[PDB]
């Protein structure tokens, strides 16, 4: 080679650098490519899969770890009383990142867009109900009654023949990133809420049990994007493989 003088870029412990690598065995032919499922080009492609979501797994006992599907159904008062509420953010630790979409979001910092949700039903023929599915974008305190649902734009829902209820939450996000701070009393940054309501009662005819509890479903659309991965935060290992 032709001689030149020294320049920075060597004699340094490097990890991020992608350098050319020298193989050891020339002209090797491994097994050829075979058509098998499960290949993924990008996680965003995976984001459009039906994803079971269980919100109110409040009990914290092992014997309850068999029936976490439950959400409260009983002899309700049937006067617009609240069933359950849950904020819009899917990127916070808990049963929210329990979903694979949420599990992937838990490693990320930024987010662009929202999700799509639905909920199933398992009543009998004559058995029906009249619930209320409502979303509120961030900017308000806890809802009170039907009037707060009136303030919130959503889609009216009813248990008819069809069980599913497609609730799409558009890209309600003005900023793509925020000023850097640390955890504390900075909870002022609200993210939204979803509220579930009864109207008449859990209605079944005589001779039918008064219990019917189901789990929720959610997924992501093309609009949402999710990247800027962070390192692992919670993993359990008492020993390391030697």
């Amino acid at each position: 080679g032709f001689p030149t003088e020294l320049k920075p870029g060597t004699n340094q412990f490097l990890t991020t650098d992608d350098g050319v690598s020298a193989p050891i065995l020339p002209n090797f032919h491994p097994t050829p490519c075979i058509h098998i499922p499960g290949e993924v080009r990008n996680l965003l492609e995976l984001c459009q899969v039906e994803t079971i979501l269980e919100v109110n797994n409040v009990p914290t006992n092992a014997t309850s770890l068999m029936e976490r599907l439950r959400f409260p159904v009983s002899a309700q008062a049937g006067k617009g009383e609240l069933c359950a509420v849950f904020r819009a953010d899917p990127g916070r630790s808990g049963p929210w990142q329990s979903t694979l979409l949420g599990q992937l979001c838990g490693y990320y910092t930024q987010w662009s867009g929202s999700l799509e949700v639905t909920f199933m039903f398992t009543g009998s023929f004559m058995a029906t109900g009249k619930m209320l599915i409502a979303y509120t974008p961030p900017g308000g305190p806890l809802p009170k009654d039907r009037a707060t649902a009136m303030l919130g734009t959503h889609v009216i829902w009813d248990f008819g023949l069809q069980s599913s209820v497609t609730l799409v939450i558009p890209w309600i996000s003005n900023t793509h990133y925020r000023a850097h701070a640390r955890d504390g009393v900075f909870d002022y940054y609200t993210t939204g809420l979803v509220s579930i309501w009864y109207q008449t009662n859990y209605v079944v005819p005589i001779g039918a049990p008064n219990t019917a509890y189901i789990i929720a479903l959610a997924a992501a659309q093309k609009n949402f994007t999710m990247k800027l991965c962070k390192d692992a935060s919670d993993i359990l290992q008492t020993g390391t493989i030697q």
Binding site: N11, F13, Y188, K230
Partner: protein, 297 residues
């Protein structure tokens, strides 16, 4: 169908930021030459007054005439935007063997342009910016000599936990690549691109970067954002061979890919914290020294 025309008042043709004015491009331009005194009309653009560009109804130069000047200067490469960097002292740090300021053996410093206001205020003259940066760490002895020790540099990406021990998990930093450097190799030279969460770095910004109601408790986040920042850097000695000489580092700063906006004028006072509007009001002094008279020094 098409019966009412209430909405047709709109002005489709969206080009730039919201306004209501309108203009139009032109294919070519205009030129002008110079001449002497003459009383004539029609074509007389010879002289130019930046605001008026004509002669008032009371004559300005009825008594004497003027002269002319020729040009021989070039302005092609006079731009400073990126090349305005010159010599100047920057700063240094130390990692001694035995000391009290470093009881842990490692030094973790928060990466930012807020290093030393003396020369940063020269660059801090702007608010909204997009640039590339460079960090150079040169290692030597506190006395000023060179010793063949074993040192290496670990990078701390933003979002990673801040190490609290010589054996913290932050050393693994799985998503961080590795740089192959050693004291024999030339000193550190690392490029830093623009990873601001917003379009530009926030210094002259009045807001609340944390959600929730604003109270007296949440006021320290002005300038020192715990998470919005681009991370820190941690330095220590790795390996069974521990160094037998104390060491010092000098940190060199350089900026590339200049792109600026929002001109903000010069500061003649001093701060006490990061981006603190507070000033020494009891000892305000003008930007320049005056004299008892202007006629004579």
């Amino acid at each position: 169908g098409d019966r009412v025309a209430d909405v047709i008042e709109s002005s489709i043709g969206d080009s730039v930021s919201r306004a209501l004015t309108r203009a139009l491009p032109a294919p070519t331009g205009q030129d002008t030459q110079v001449s002497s005194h003459r009383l004539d009309t029609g074509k007389v653009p010879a002289l130019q007054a930046a605001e008026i560009g004509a002669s008032s109804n009371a004559s300005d130069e009825s008594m004497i005439e003027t002269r002319c000047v020729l040009n021989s200067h070039s302005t092609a490469e006079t731009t400073l935007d990126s090349f305005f960097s010159r010599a100047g002292l920057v700063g240094e740090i130390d990692l001694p063997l035995e000391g009290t300021t470093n009881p842990n053996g490692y030094a973790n410093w928060d990466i930012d342009i807020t290093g030393y206001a003396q020369m940063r205020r020269k660059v801090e003259l702007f608010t909204y910016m997009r640039f590339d940066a460079e960090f150079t760490f040169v290692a030597c002895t506190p006395t000023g000599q060179v010793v063949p020790q074993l040192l290496q540099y670990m990078f701390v990406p933003p979002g990673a936990p801040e190490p609290d021990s010589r054996e913290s998990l932050a050393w693994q930093t799985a998503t961080n690549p590795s740089v192959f450097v050693k004291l024999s190799d030339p000193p550190a030279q690392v490029s830093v691109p623009f990873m601001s969460p917003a379009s530009a770095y926030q210094w002259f910004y009045d807001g609340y970067p944390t959600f929730g109601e604003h109270k007296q408790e949440k006021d320290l986040e002005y300038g020192a954002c715990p998470n919005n920042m681009m991370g820190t850097f941690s330095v220590r000695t790795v390996g069974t061979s521990k160094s037998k000489y104390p060491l010092v580092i000098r940190i060199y700063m350089r900026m590339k890919h200049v792109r600026a906006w929002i001109p903000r004028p010069m500061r003649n006072q001093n701060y006490l914290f990061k981006a603190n509007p507070n000033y020494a009001g009891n000892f305000i002094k003008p930007t320049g020294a005056s004299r008892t008279a202007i006629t004579t020094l």
